[PDB]
């Protein structure tokens with residue numbers, strides 16, 4: 001409801017400005033205009049996947065703030081840094097193996 | 105010819121031709137080619153207009169320095185008309201509309217305005233005159249555009265008996281509202297609504313062909329008082345044309361908009377002219393007489409609708 005109604009209005013308003021901006025200038029008779037007139041490079045794909053994998057490990061970090069409330073902290077603190085280091089290694093691997101070519 | 109109008113030069117841009125032409129309603133689709141052709145050889149041109157001076161800018165490159173003049177006038181007034189025609193070696197009337205307003209109905213633009221211009225030219229002693237009539241003129245015709253047109257063809261032949269009235273068929277070109285009419289207006293956002301376009305015969309003509317005809321008429325001394333009609337070299341059927349159009353325009357086809365402010369599209373009376381057959385008048389001299397050959401619609405329809413074509417087509421079958 002409240003959020004729904006707020007969400008509905010935002011995009012409801014968005015389209016109108018889009019519709020009005022697009023269409024209203026149409027009915028202006030500005031004569032008529034004449035007619036004007038890919039290499040898959042490897043570098044750009046590598047970053048796409050690299051972002052995905054690195055992003056995925058983020059989802060495992062998001063619970064962190066709730067995890068710190070657990071009475072079993074020795075384990076939580078151990079594992080919490082475990083993911084980060086594994087994330088650290090992941091980057092470390094690409095750097096040494098020349099992975100970050102786009103960075104160059 | 106007057107001392108200042110004797111021919112001089114080689115007919116280029118800055119060469120003097122000697123044709124002081126006054127074009128009425130030159131802002132239209134037909135006029136801009138006539139102005140451009142007159143400007144091409146450097147003939148002095150006066151261009152009365154009604155719209156904003158901004159709308160006349162595109163005509164400026166078409167003429168050399170001091171060859172294009174943009175006065176003001178009003179159809180309802182004749183004082184303004186006299187100024188623009190006081191010393192013209194010829195006067196051309198191209199006024200017209202495809203729809204009626206609450207200011208100037210069909211008769212006003214097709215009867216009085218063509219006339220009022222004619223008389224002043226006689227009063228001012230204009231040596232020549234040109235008038236654009238419609239091929240299908242007849243007072244018993246259905247299309248009020250034509251019925252209104254048919255009246256004008258008479259007074260112009262009377263007020264200025266030597267005025268070379270011309271009656272071209274449908275015209276097409278880059279900015280035309282006939283070939284562009286079918287491609288966009290008929291189809292866009294709307295499935296074709298052709299009312300059995302099986303009997304109609306349409307024989308359009310190319311705009312450049314008409315433009316060359318007019319200039320040749322001005323030069324000719326024997327063309328005084330005659331009457332001409334310009335028609336493409338190949339006749340066609342209405343239904344055959346539309347179907348062929350979508351082949352060049354590559355739009356989907358399915359065989360078979362009101363009147364509002366602004367410039368209306370698909371008006372009530374405009375329909376009658378699309379369905380109205382093109383008259384066959386073998387006795388009236390036409391383009392071939394003016395040293396001008398009709399250009400087949402096949403050769404030139406490519407350029408006009410190339411823009412309609414988003415981002416090997418058998419030419420349309422003819423009908424005798």
Ligand SMILES: NC(=O)C1=CN([C@@H]2O[C@H](COP(=O)(O)OP(=O)(O)OC[C@H]3O[C@@H](n4cnc5c(N)ncnc54)[C@H](OP(=O)(O)O)[C@@H]3O)[C@@H](O)[C@H]2O)C=CC1
Pocket residue numbers: 128129130131132133134135154155178179198199200201202208213236237238239271272273274275281282
């Ligand atoms: N395709 C066709 O229809 C064919 C051509 N003809 C005739 O050729 C003539 C010119 O063709 P075209 O250029 O396409 O016609 P247009 O629709 O482009 O109009 C021609 C001129 O008339 C002006 N006009 C309209 N109303 C008035 C008015 N009250 N007073 C003064 N000027 C006015 C227009 O100016 P503004 O825009 O400011 O109103 C325009 O400059 C037409 O009159 C037509 O009858 C004949 C056979 C076929």
